[PDB]
Design a protein around this motif. Structure first.
Motif, PDB file in Angstrom:
ATOM      1  N   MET E  85       0.818  -1.205   0.000  1.00  0.00           N
ATOM      2  CA  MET E  85       0.000   0.000   0.000  1.00  0.00           C
ATOM      3  C   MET E  85       0.853   1.256   0.000  1.00  0.00           C
ATOM      4  SD  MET E  85      -3.028  -0.965  -0.335  1.00  0.00           S
ATOM      5  CE  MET E  85      -2.545  -2.508  -1.102  1.00  0.00           C
ATOM      6  N   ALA E  86       2.153   1.125   0.262  1.00  0.00           N
ATOM      7  CA  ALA E  86       3.026   2.292   0.275  1.00  0.00           C
ATOM      8  C   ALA E  86       3.248   2.824  -1.130  1.00  0.00           C
ATOM      9  CB  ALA E  86       4.359   1.945   0.930  1.00  0.00           C
ATOM     10  N   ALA E  87       3.591   1.941  -2.065  1.00  0.00           N
ATOM     11  CA  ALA E  87       3.806   2.382  -3.436  1.00  0.00           C
ATOM     12  C   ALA E  87       2.486   2.624  -4.145  1.00  0.00           C
ATOM     13  CB  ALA E  87       4.640   1.353  -4.191  1.00  0.00           C
ATOM     14  N   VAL E  89      -0.286   4.110  -2.923  1.00  0.00           N
ATOM     15  CA  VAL E  89      -0.792   5.461  -2.700  1.00  0.00           C
ATOM     16  C   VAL E  89       0.086   6.490  -3.394  1.00  0.00           C
ATOM     17  CG1 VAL E  89      -1.876   4.795  -0.552  1.00  0.00           C
ATOM     18  CG2 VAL E  89       0.418   5.711  -0.531  1.00  0.00           C
ATOM     19  N   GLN E  90       1.297   6.111  -3.793  1.00  0.00           N
ATOM     20  CA  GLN E  90       2.067   6.966  -4.685  1.00  0.00           C
ATOM     21  C   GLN E  90       1.503   6.908  -6.098  1.00  0.00           C
ATOM     22  OE1 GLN E  90       5.298   9.196  -4.506  1.00  0.00           O
ATOM     23  NE2 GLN E  90       3.754   9.554  -6.077  1.00  0.00           N
ATOM     24  N   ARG E  93      -1.491   9.208  -6.254  1.00  0.00           N
ATOM     25  CA  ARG E  93      -1.115  10.616  -6.264  1.00  0.00           C
ATOM     26  C   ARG E  93      -0.502  11.022  -7.597  1.00  0.00           C
ATOM     27  NH1 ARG E  93      -2.074  14.245  -3.107  1.00  0.00           N
ATOM     28  NH2 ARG E  93      -3.007  12.561  -1.861  1.00  0.00           N
ATOM     29  N   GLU E 124      -4.791   4.660   3.521  1.00  0.00           N
ATOM     30  CA  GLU E 124      -3.438   5.192   3.607  1.00  0.00           C
ATOM     31  C   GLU E 124      -3.280   6.496   2.843  1.00  0.00           C
ATOM     32  OE1 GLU E 124      -2.476   1.434   5.592  1.00  0.00           O
ATOM     33  OE2 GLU E 124      -3.900   1.992   4.027  1.00  0.00           O
ATOM     34  N   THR E 126      -4.979   9.742   3.250  1.00  0.00           N
ATOM     35  CA  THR E 126      -4.985  10.874   4.192  1.00  0.00           C
ATOM     36  C   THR E 126      -4.728  12.232   3.534  1.00  0.00           C
ATOM     37  OG1 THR E 126      -2.631  10.890   4.830  1.00  0.00           O
ATOM     38  CG2 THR E 126      -4.066   9.297   5.949  1.00  0.00           C
TER      39      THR E 126
END
Lengths: 126, 119, 126, 119, 126, 119, 126, 119, 126, 119
Positions: E85-87, E89-90, E93, E124, E126
């Motif tokens: 989920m870290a990459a 949400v990039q 964006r 994630e 926000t």
């Protein structure tokens, strides 16, 4: 020049042309695929230049060459009739100067060889 | 056996690959080959003016106008002048002034190079 | 230049093309696998440029190259119609300035060859 | 026997691997090969500028903006100007100022280096 | 640099790629075992990027690359959904700034390509 | 005969082992190879602070925090800042200060060493 | 002085530079590694001098020398922007006295060659 | 075999290094060599008046104004006056009175040296 | 003088130029790389001198020399058109004194050789 | 075998370098070589009067007018006066008085120097 002459003479063409002639009659040489592609494309240019037999007189090379040039544009995959009529009016003006030829009779031979209307060359003449 | 124009074209090829006349046809001249150099010079001369003419007027560079201007340079040399008049009606309006620039406004440079090529 | 010309001539390409042709006619050469992948991709480009035959006049290389360019973006595995319309409006504006061509007639040939609606190109023209 | 476009592509390849024209096609020009060098220079000029633009504004670096900025550098040279305007609507908003920076605010360095690459 | 270019040219890559192709057609080359392990692992990544076809506009290399990085974390033998989920949400964006894309429509494409729920990525964001 | 993606990978390998292009792909560069040296340095510089930070706070050394602290150093350079925020929530609570120690409090030493490696 | 002229004549540099040219053509001399360090470091100075083509008129050697001196401070391992601007505003004052050149047009050519913002040179000009 | 201007330049160089005509071309003259001395004399005298001019009026010394002042000295000797008239507009305003100083205000010392040098 | 004539005579340049020609014909001498750098740079000056063919009359050595000096400034890496126009108007004044040559006809031949507009030379004439 | 004029020119050159007839052709005369002295003396005297002429009337010095004035001196010695009458119209107006100065107004010094050379 004689120096360019002698270098093709020593290559032995007269004997070599006689060997390939004999090999063809003994069925050892078939028709190359370059020649079969050649006669398909060229056959429309040969019968169209024979249609200028009724033009009489002088060196008729310029009349012949511009009919061959103008036909090449119409036979393109994207034909350009604007450039095809450009070389055609050069053939009409060059035919007009020969002894015995009229402007109307040169429009008969040129438009008959190209296979277009007579007025299509009369438009660009002016 | 047979003698038609297709087989006359074929047997004309067969003697060239036999006696090796295509390569000795080029390597015995050594004088006509200088015409390739003068040809490759004029094509560079026409092209750099063709892009310069497009940047002074803001018009996009039209490809193939370097080829049209080279045909009109050769026909002007021979004298086929009503061949010229129909092509000048065929090109767009803003490029008509470029074609007479090759023929006349670069008479001294470009037509002299064609005069030395045929010579 | 001549020195770059002479270096390809001494490799003997005329005989080597003639012997390679004879090997194909004697069934010794099969169709290369690079050729099969070539004609599957290019066949859509060849007929799409033959549909610009009714555009008449000047050097049409800029009209032809931009329709080939704009169709390539639609044929990507992730097609981008935004950059496809970018080269397409270059094909329309370059078509307008030829003698005999209208803005509405250039939209017929460009959108006909691409196979898209005419209103898509008119949106991006402005 | 046959003459179609598929085998014309094949038989054109077959003479190349026979007479070895590909390797002598690269090694016999050897003057045009500096165009590789000026190309590898300009792409480095754009890339180091593109990351510097991304850290002054705090935006994440957008890959593929190099090819957009180099496409518009070549179209500006030729003059394809409404090709430019539709691509300028395609990129995001904060990167439009970078694209006019490549074309105009590096006119003296980058466009001059293109003018030597085509020469 | 030309020097790194010239050294790979003299290895004869054009000729030797032609010979290995001919050996395949004459059944002398079988499928290498490195290739069979490759296509089995990569088949999940090839069809996941083709589901991002409806994302339109700008250079989309960052949206494409961050989806492939996010899919790779789920396919480890011990999957880490937190770093996946870290990459991701990039990727939402990076998609959001393109002309024509919304925050909801980019959430459709990324969660559809990864095959997860939309509300996982919305946590994630926000 | 056939053209699928599996054999394109296979026939792509076959020209490498024939021409021996893997080894000449490395030994012809010799300028990109100093990037391995700088990469071997920052791996040591990150690790030596990782055991030092674990000994001042009395906590056990957490292996694999080296690659986490090295990933965030590269993403800080590019600008991917919300990839930082989700990773910083993923690590344990006492190691969050170490990751901002690598990024910010070792700006001059570590991030400049990255700035020479990409250059 | 012809004395120092003579002692370089008797060294025979015309014959020596001819012979070392023939060695390079016969592949007996490779590129010295001093040369590789030269053109990698000089090439930023050569292409910046060519950016002053639009400065017209008088001896422009002082404009060329100070824009070369300004790059030398920006190219150090620890660059000094203040000492670079000292040599930069000297080039502006040398440029504006030339015929046809304005003070504003000389700020374009110097900041265009250095590749900096124009207001940095205007701040030190006073 | 061949005789073009490229090869004609080469065969004139091979005939020089074969029989060593460059070094015997210089060392046999030995009367024209004293023109190098007088050229170095006028060169120094022009340069000192440039820095003399620059300090009485407080203007910065302009490098390359020696070569402008030397060429207009030689053209005044030949008689190319409208060649002078364009260059006097091309140089800046404060240095114009220096350029007529070399022609006229040292008519005695400088022109007699050139009139001796060509003699 | 004769003593300077003798010391080049005893070098045997007649015999040594004969062997250098024969060595070229036996292919033991290739072209120098100074020759390649020469004819690439000189050929712009060679054909512009031939463009003054219609200047008729007197010793034309000054018109030829001053139009070559004008090309030397325009061909610099930093071209100076103002110093180029200085030598151009000197050739126009040298041409117009010849019998039969008009001041307008001299502006044709000079601007035709340099390849510039006629107004750039007329402005500096005054 | 063959005997033509191209081959007759060659076979004369081959026997010159075989027996070294060129260098013994110059060194065995040793009396004709003083004509090179006298021609160099007249050549300087024409050049000095040309710059003296161009400075008195303020006209620019015309290069090649010393070469013209030397041919008119020699034809005056032979007597080809109608060839003089055409070249007097071909040169410009202000230089015609210089051309009759080399023929008539230095009839003493210059014609005697030619007359001692041909003897």
């Amino acid at each position: 020049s004689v120096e360019v002459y002698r270098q093709k003479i020593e290559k032995g063409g007269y004997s070599a042309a006689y060997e390939a002639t004999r090999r063809y009659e003994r069925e050892e040489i078939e028709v190359l695929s370059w020649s079969s592609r050649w006669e398909s494309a060229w056959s429309k240019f040969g019968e169209a230049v024979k249609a200028l037999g009724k033009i009489e007189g002088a060196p008729r090379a310029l009349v012949i060459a511009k009919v061959q040039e103008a036909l090449a544009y119409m036979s393109k995959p994207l034909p350009n009739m604007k450039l095809a009529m450009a070389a055609a009016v050069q053939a009409v003006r060059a035919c007009e100067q020969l002894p015995g030829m009229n402007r109307e009779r040169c429009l008969d031979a040129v438009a008959g060889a190209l296979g277009v209307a007579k007025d299509w060359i009369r438009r660009e003449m002016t | 056996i047979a003698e038609t124009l297709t087989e006359k074209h074929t047997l004309g090829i067969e003697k060239v690959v036999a006696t090796d006349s295509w390569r000795v046809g080029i390597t015995s001249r050594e004088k006509k080959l200088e015409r390739i150099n003068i040809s490759a010079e004029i094509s560079r001369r026409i092209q750099d003016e063709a892009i310069a003419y497009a940047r002074n007027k803001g018009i996009p560079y039209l490809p193939g106008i370097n080829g049209i201007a080279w045909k009109l340079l050769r026909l002007k040399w021979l004298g086929y002048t009503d061949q010229i008049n129909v092509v000048m009606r065929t090109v767009p309006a803003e490029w008509r002034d470029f074609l007479t620039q090759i023929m006349e406004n670069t008479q001294m440079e470009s037509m002299y190079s064609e005069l030395r090529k045929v010579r």
